[PDB]
Amino acid sequence: ACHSLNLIAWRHLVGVTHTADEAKQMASEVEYEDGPDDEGNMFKRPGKLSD
Amino acid sequence: ISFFPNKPMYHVQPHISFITPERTMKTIPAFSRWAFAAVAGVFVFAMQVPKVKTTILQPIAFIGDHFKDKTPEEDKW
To answer: Does the CB of A49 have a partner CB in chain B at under 8 Å?
Structure first.
């Protein structure tokens, strides 16, 4: 809620505390920004395993 | 006709400087052994390259167990 850990990726957890499917399912919940598209714009996308 | 008339059991042979055939016939095993040693060293220094492992090492029996990947279904993302 208050601290940040912006140096550990989702893929860092598979094999240490989670499996690939569990990590992917957990990461799909959160949302991220995914660059421009067509006529510029800034949209949102579901999370991936490399964020 | 003969190099030494008093002893016909003496014949000169083709050469360049000292590269006479007998010397090379003596030398050949040294070249074979040196080439084998060089091949063994090259094979030793490249036993962890993935292509070598997946082409040569694994199909070899007994030792092939060691040079595998043992990670279960939890693997690369």
So the answer is: yes
